[model samples]
Target: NSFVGLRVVAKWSSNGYFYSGKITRDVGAGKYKLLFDDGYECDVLGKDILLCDPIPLDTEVTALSEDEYFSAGVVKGHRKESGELYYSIEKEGQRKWYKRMAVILSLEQGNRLREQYGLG
Candidate 1:
């Protein structure tokens, strides 16, 4: 691993629901986009809220530099608002490296989002 800042934030759910957080890629220039579970995308900077993070971009998915490595299913799913995502990547080396990211979501919320996004 590398030394990348891990920026995280949690918010109180007005309805006592699970608190949602935003993790943005901050590389000093400014806040960039975020890829949530599935492939839900979010712009973290200059939004109505102050939700942002400039942590090190340790997103290893794009870091694997191997010819034998392969990735699949890099797309967004679930609600566009709550923004959830999932992705899987695989690469071959002396061994094989496979990575999968699943954004946390409540069953109900997930189903709704999936349906809305045609991922259900």
Candidate 2:
């Protein structure tokens, strides 16, 4: 498949975290070189590359944190000044309700979590 110019994710061996980048070149032989928007280059096997889709408002996303607040749910939004992400987890009871939670610190962290959870 042609992946040039598409936003993608690949693992960085240094920290074992996935980072977002653009597919800059197809190095051939089922390999690719990624130019991370965060400013770095890493080569990855084509099969390991994942498509990065835009996170639409109110889209359902699994919580990456094992912590209490961010248990699981859809993205509510991000803070304008801080870029922090927050979401709400369902608390089913006599009536369905939501428990607001916050966790992700930035877009970079959110992307990494998304890749980890296989939301693509």
Candidate 3:
């Protein structure tokens, strides 16, 4: 369907758990464009998506590293207007923030992201 601002839980290739997004455009062929609640957008297949209820918060979400090999970060908290899942990445006593598109929910998704680091 198109938008009445329909809500959805959409698949992210870099992780297992679905992230929150909504259909913004109907592309036909079982696919749709999405705008995630956190703050980004994409076009994904229908099989990879489902209708949604508000996602439970603080449930061990993952955010990724930028300009480097991918790694998961804990979701520190959501912003007020932005509602984006921000992080506190730990390196040598490290802390950093990630882009919203980098945020995902997963079960040890690190292995998958790491596997992509090398051009095998």
Candidate 4:
């Protein structure tokens, strides 16, 4: 796997939204979808921030205490921006999306990566 891919350099503001310059420097290791809109303005490519399902805000907090809350958890799936799966829950008055990244390798591969990096 190579470390070269989309590089986020600068950000721009339009109306109340933000736009940015996202460049694909090299071919990323794994297959990924590029999510960009409002004119090739912005992009984010990297591991997801979370690795588990996303819980809805409306879920009962009590059930969560017993770990039953996780039953209602949702998976958002890979996002074009962060290049990872995600989970989200939307409601009439609210919307929320949780980010989760799936590692491209297993424990052995991860160790091999460290050695390759001159963790050598």
RMSD each, Å: 15.5, 8.4, 8.6, 14.1
Per-model TM values vs. the true structure = 0.21, 0.48, 0.44, 0.19
Q: After superposition, how far is residue 104 of candidate 4 from its true place, in Å?
A: 26
lDDT string for model 2 (13-65, tens) is 66654555678888888888889766788787765565643333454443444
Q: Write the per-residue lDDT of candidate 1 for residues 9-111, one digit (tens) a residue.
A: 2212332111123345543334444444334555443221222221112122221234653332212212222343223322343223222222222333323
Error of 2 at 85 (Å): 12
Lowest lDDT 10-residue stretch of candidate 3 = 111-120
What digit string (tens of lDDT, one per residue) describes model 3 on residues 36-110?
877788777776665533323333445555765565444444443366444444433445655555655563432
Instruction: Quote model 3's TM-score.
Output: 0.44
Reference-based lDDT, each prediction = 0.29, 0.51, 0.55, 0.28
For model 3, what is the error of residue 24's alpha carbon versus the real structure, in angstroms, after optimal superposition? 0.4
Which candidate wins on lDDT? 3
Q: What is the lDDT of residue 12 in candidate 4?
A: 26
lDDT of 3: 0.55
Q: Candidate 2: TM-score?
A: 0.48
Which residue window of length 10 is worst by lDDT in model 1?
48-57
Per-residue lDDT tens digits for candidate 4, residues 1-120, read 543333221222232211122334432443222223234533232331111122222332111213333222322233446554443433343434543321122223222223222111
